[PDB]
Structure formats: structure tokens, C-alpha cells
Amino acid sequence: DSQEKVSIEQQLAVESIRKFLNSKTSYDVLPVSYRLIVLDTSLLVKKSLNVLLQNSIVSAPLWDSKTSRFAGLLTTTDFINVIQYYFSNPDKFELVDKLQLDGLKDIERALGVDTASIHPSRPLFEACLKMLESRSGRIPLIDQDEETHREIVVSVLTQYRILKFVALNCRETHFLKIPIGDLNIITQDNMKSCQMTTPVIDVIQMLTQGRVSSVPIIDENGYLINVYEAYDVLGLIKGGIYNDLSLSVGEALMRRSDDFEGVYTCTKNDKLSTIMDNIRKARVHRFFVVDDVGRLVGVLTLSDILKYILLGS
Amino acid sequence: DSTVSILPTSLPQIHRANMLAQGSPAASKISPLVTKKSKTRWHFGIRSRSYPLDVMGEIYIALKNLGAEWAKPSEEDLWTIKLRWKYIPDLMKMVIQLFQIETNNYLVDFKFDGWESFSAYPFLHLTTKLIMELAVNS
Amino acid sequence: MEYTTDIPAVFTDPSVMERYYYTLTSWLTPPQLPPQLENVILNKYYATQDQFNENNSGALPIPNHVVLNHLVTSSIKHNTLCVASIVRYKQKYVTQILYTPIE
Ligand SMILES: NC(=O)C1=CN([C@@H]2O[C@H](COP(=O)(O)OP(=O)(O)OC[C@H]3O[C@@H](n4cnc5c(N)ncnc54)[C@H](O)[C@@H]3O)[C@@H](O)[C@H]2O)C=CC1
């Protein structure tokens, strides 16, 4: 009876959130005034890194001044590629140092590695769907220039901001009281992880190999100690690094800024109500699921949370 | 109730301290990245210490060398340049205006005006060309 | 209007401005800078945006409609130019910022 009640209020809360997403556009998530930072593709990768760090961002649309076209987004992945190229080609330090953003495609070719957008006026639910299935944590908001008839970046919408927008407007999240363990939305199987002595380069390899935002760092006995995020790669490359390539992840983590907000953990008995509370109060990108004693059992990311909201169990 | 925590060993101060206690040599060598996010001072357009006709002269020379065209100004609007720049509409329109801040201090205001046979980046890129041309000719 | 690449004589020939001075008010000198385009206002407009995303204070800074589509600049840093324009998107306002190198 009490578990049947918990279950119906959850459905009630989910159906309400869903209706909110179907009733709002991506444009509605936009602040009334905001900044869009765009980088000309002839800018040095080196300098574009400083731009991102100065302005507390991790992504920026790219603009080709020769063709008057947008040319995709700069993300941590691009910097992974540069690191991987350099590690494999340590002789090419000069090329890497003078690498321009439009030279990024040649780096990709040398490595042999292979973008969703949405019209702002479209339903926010639809923006959530497209972002999920593009396997990206971001979606550029693109419209058409009324004069030139050209594709224009209006903004970049992130999973975090969407979930925060939901959380802020919809206090019904409080009634999502089913433990996440009973919801079958945590990834438990085939956790890609490493240890403190694992070379950072191999962890970076794991990032692109698994197509994941972070690698959990455990000890011999499976206790979660820390995490390596793709975001950390920016810090790693900052100021040009060469001796600090074959470094261990533990060593590389000392580059982390003192205002690093930390890694979030939870257990299977935590509720999405609490999870949304945290998203609402702080920029949290995932919750690593541990057991009673702090051993890693799994992870609950923003994409998992959003997938549940849209699709269910 | 809530078992949502921040992992203490994930925090820089504890991670460092554990690495130092483990004896790691890189613990003392590696310092945390301190990104000095310095607030940039923003201004509309560019300022100039030269005088009106001199400044207006400089601007037109830049415009001409950059391949732009402009209207013939009347007496009432001498310090206004209604220009057109080659770069589906083909020609970008700009309105440049000279303002006075002080007797020796002037501001060159640039305004996007449209297209002739929305995104500000074509406009921003062109003003970039213009600003750079003006800096050389000084 | 008719468009041409001929620089107005007033800026190339001293005779033209001389005639104006001599032939018997405000139009002989450039107009004063409008209060809206003052850099103290532009940056408190920047500080209120930063105050909302880092501290959460008050409401977001609506720009004055006067400044829309006007070029914003800053000092050249690391051979990189940083220009911006505050533009309209529906009922929202986008400060479109561009970083370009000096080549
Ligand atoms: N290079 C690429 O293609 C990359 C793609 N992405 C994608 O971005 C989207 C959203 O990202 P986020 O919300 O940050 O989620 P995420 O990037 O952490 O998502 C990865 C998926 O696998 C799970 N996961 C996360 N870390 C894992 C690990 N270390 N080992 C095993 N499974 C792990 C998550 O629960 C999630 O279902 C995801 O679809 C993710 O795949 C993220 C990084 C790189």
C-alpha cells in the first residue's frame, strides 16, 4: 500500500516533468541575456585552450571566416586527439604547438578517428531526445539568419542546464522517491576503471575507447578513490606539457585546481528526489554509486537521469 | 536518509596529502593550475586621441584600402559614415559614428546595418579587418 | 542612396571645412557620447550577468536597446582580437563574442 503509493506519485512526478518538457522549447531555457563565445578556426588550439579556461567553459562553437560557416564545436575530445597524436608523434612538438583549429581535421586523419543541432523553437523534450541519441552532453541551438539564409548558432544547451531548468521549475521532483537501485537506470556492467598508478595517457585512451566523460579510480580492493574526467585534460595540456605525458593519473591529478568541486557519490538507496536536489544546488555531472563501505558498484550520469525521465525504466 | 556525498579523497587537498604520504616525488613538484580569471574591460568601439577630421580621414583610407564603398554625407551628418562592404544578399551595410568623450578623446562607434543585393560574426570579422588596418596606419 | 569609393572632400581638402567655419552650432563638431554607450554602464551590464551565474544576485541585465548591433572591443591579448556585439534573439539578448588571431 505504501509502496504502491510511492510508485504512483513517482509516475505522477515523471509524467509532470515530461509534460513540462513537451510544453517548453529549448529557447525557454535561455537566460533573458547571455554570452556566446565563438572561436575563429584559424585560432591556435593552444590559445583556444586559454579562452575556454579563462571563461570557465569547456566548449565553444567554431567559425570559418573564409566561408562564413560554422564548423562544429570545440570540446575536450578535440584536445584528447591532440594529446594522443602528440604521444604517438613526440617528434611533431612544433606542429602541435603551432596547430590551428582548422588543422584539427588532419590530426584526426593521422589518428584514424571518426554533431546534432536543434532549432530553438522546437520542444525541449525533442532537444533532450536528440542530445541523448547523438551520444553527446551538449546540443548547439541553431537557427537561420533572416538575411543571409545561413545556419547560426544561437547558443549551446547542455544536459546539466536542462536538468537544472527542470529541477528549478518543477518541485515535483521531490515525489521521485523510488530508490535508484529499483529503477534499473544505473550502469553496473563493464565499468571501465583504473588505479592511481595507471599512466594518465592510458586513462585518456580509456576515455575515447569507451566514449565516456570520466574514468573512476579504484584501489586494489575496489574502493572508489578518485575520478579522471575528460575536463581534466584541459588542465593537463595547459601551458604545454611534454614531461607530464607518461605521468601516472595520480600525479596528473595534482594539476587539478583547488576550486575543483569534487566527485559525487551515492548508493542504490538514494532517490532521484535527492539527486535533483543536488543538481538544483550544484553543478554535478554524475553520481558514482558505491556500497555501504565505499566500493564502486556503478555510475549514474546526467544522460542516465535524462534517459529515465524521457523513456522510463 | 540521503547517502549523497562528496568523495573526500577526490578533493585536491586530500589527494595531494595522500600522494605526499605515499612518498611520491611529483607531489611537491606539481603545483595546482591557478587560472587567473582576470575581468576584461569592455568598450564600445575604439577610442582615439587624434582630432575629428584626422580620425575621419584615417577611417576612410582604411575603408578604401579594404575595398569598401560609402554614401556622400551631408552637412548635418559629417561624422557619420554610411558604408557598404562586398565581403542571397551580397553587400554588408555598416554605420560608423564619431562621438566626443573629451576635447582630446574620441570614440569610433561601429554599427551593423544589414544586407543588400541574426548572426553578427560576418560583421565582427570585418570590423576586425578594419580595426587592424587602422592600427597599422598609425 | 548612391555609393562610391570617393572620400568626402571635407576630410581631404582643407578648403571645405574652412568654408563651413566662415559662412555665417553643434554640427561642426562630433556629437557627445550617449550615456548608453558609456563603458561604465557596459561593464556593470557585464558584472550583473556574472553576479547571477556565480553568486545569484537580483535579475539578469537586460541591455538598453540603443547598444544593440554595436561593436564591443577589448585590449588585444596574446595576439588575439576579442570583439563582440549584443544582438536580439526573439525576446532574449545574445552577446556574440568572437576570438580571432592577428595574422
Ligand atoms: N567520444 C565520445 O563519443 C564521447 C561521448 N560521450 C557521450 O556524452 C553523452 C552524455 O555524457 P554524460 O552524461 O557525461 O555520461 P557519460 O559520458 O558518463 O556516459 C557514458 C554511459 O556509460 C556509463 N558510464 C560512464 N562512465 C563509465 C565508465 N567509466 N565505465 C563504464 N560506463 C560508464 C554512464 O552511466 C552512461 O550510461 C553520453 O552518451 C556519452 O556516451 C562522452 C564522452 C565522449
UniProtKB/Swiss-Prot annotation, chain A:
Amino-acid positions noted as binding ATP in the UniProt annotation, renumbered to this chain: T187, K192, S213, S214, T301, L302, S303, D304
Role: Adenine nucleotides-binding subunit gamma of AMP-activated protein kinase (AMPK), an energy sensor protein kinase that plays a key role in regulating cellular energy metabolism. In response to reduction of intracellular ATP levels, AMPK activates energy-producing pathways and inhibits energy-consuming processes: inhibits protein, carbohydrate and lipid biosynthesis, as well as cell growth and proliferation. AMPK acts via direct phosphorylation of metabolic enzymes, and by longer-term effects via phosphorylation of transcription regulators.
Originating species: Saccharomyces cerevisiae (strain ATCC 204508 / S288c) (Baker's yeast)
Effect seen on changing C128Y: Reduces glucose inhibition of SNF1 and leads to resistance to 2-deoxyglucose
Gene Ontology molecular function terms on file: AMP binding; ATP binding; identical protein binding; protein kinase binding; protein kinase regulator activity; protein serine/threonine kinase activator activity
Protein name, as recorded: 5'-AMP-activated protein kinase subunit gamma
GO biological process assignments: autophagy; cellular response to glucose starvation; filamentous growth; peroxisome organization; positive regulation of gluconeogenesis; regulation of carbon utilization; regulation of cellular response to glucose starvation; regulation of glycolytic process
Extra facts: Present with 11700 molecules/cell in log phase SD medium.
Residues that bind AMP: T187, K192, S213, S214, T301, L302, S303, D304
Family designation: Belongs to the 5'-AMP-activated protein kinase gamma subunit family.
Keywords noted in UniProt: ATP-binding, Carbohydrate metabolism, CBS domain, Cytoplasm, Nucleotide-binding, Nucleus, Repeat, Transcription, Transcription regulation
Positions of ADP 1 binding: I37, R138, T158, Q159, Y160, R161, R283, V284, H285
SMART domains attached to this UniProt entry: CBS (SM00116)
Listed result of changing L234E: Decreases SNF1-activation efficiency
Localization per record: Nucleus; Cytoplasm
Keyword presence, S-adenosyl-L-methionine: no
Keyword Nucleotide-binding: yes
Domain CBS: 32-92, 113-173, 186-245, 254-313
Curated annotation (Swiss-Prot), chain B:
Intracellular or extracellular location(s): Cytoplasm; Nucleus; Nucleus membrane
Gene induction: Expression of the SNF1 gene itself is not glucose repressible.
Molecular functions (GO terms): AMP-activated protein kinase activity; ATP binding; guanyl-nucleotide exchange factor activity; identical protein binding; molecular function activator activity; protein kinase activity; protein serine kinase activity; protein serine/threonine kinase activity
Chief location category: cytoplasm
Cellular component aspect of the GO annotation: cellular bud neck septin ring; cytoplasm; mitochondrion; nuclear envelope lumen; nuclear membrane; nucleotide-activated protein kinase complex; nucleus; vacuolar membrane
Described purpose of this protein according to its UniProt entry: Serine/threonine protein kinase essential for release from glucose repression. Catalytic subunit of the AMP-activated protein kinase complex also known as the SNF1 kinase complex (Snf1c), a central regulator of cellular energy homeostasis, which, in response to a fall in intracellular ATP levels, activates energy-producing pathways and inhibits energy-consuming processes. The complex phosphorylates histone H3 to form H3S10ph, which promotes H3K14ac formation, leading to transcriptional activation through TBP recruitment to the promoters.
Family listed: Belongs to the protein kinase superfamily. CAMK Ser/Thr protein kinase family. SNF1 subfamily.
Listed name of the protein: Carbon catabolite-derepressing protein kinase
Organism: Saccharomyces cerevisiae (strain ATCC 204508 / S288c) (Baker's yeast)
Gene name linked to the record: SNF1
Full-length numbering of the shown residues: 464 to 630 of 633
UniProtKB/Swiss-Prot annotation, chain C:
Region (Association with SNF1 kinase complex (ASC) domain): 26-103
UniProt PTM: Phosphorylated by SNF1 in vitro.
Compartment(s): Cytoplasm; Cell membrane
Family of the protein in this entry: Belongs to the 5'-AMP-activated protein kinase beta subunit family.
Record note on quaternary structure: Component of the SNF1 kinase complex, a heterotrimeric complex composed of the catalytic alpha subunit SNF1, one of the three related beta subunits SIP1, SIP2 or GAL83, and the regulatory gamma subunit SNF4. The beta subunit serves as a bridge between the catalytic and the regulatory subunit. Interacts (via KIS domain) with SNF1. Interacts (via ASC domain) with SNF4.
Stated role: Beta subunit of the SNF1 kinase complex, which is required for transcriptional, metabolic, and developmental adaptations in response to glucose limitation. Has a structural role, mediating heterotrimer formation, and a regulatory role, defining carbon source-regulated subcellular location and substrate specificity of the SNF1 kinase complex. Involved in the regulation of aging. Acts as a negative regulator of nuclear SNF1 activity in young cells by sequestering its activating gamma subunit at the plasma membrane.
Descriptive protein name: SNF1 protein kinase subunit beta-2
Protein species of origin: Saccharomyces cerevisiae (strain ATCC 204508 / S288c)
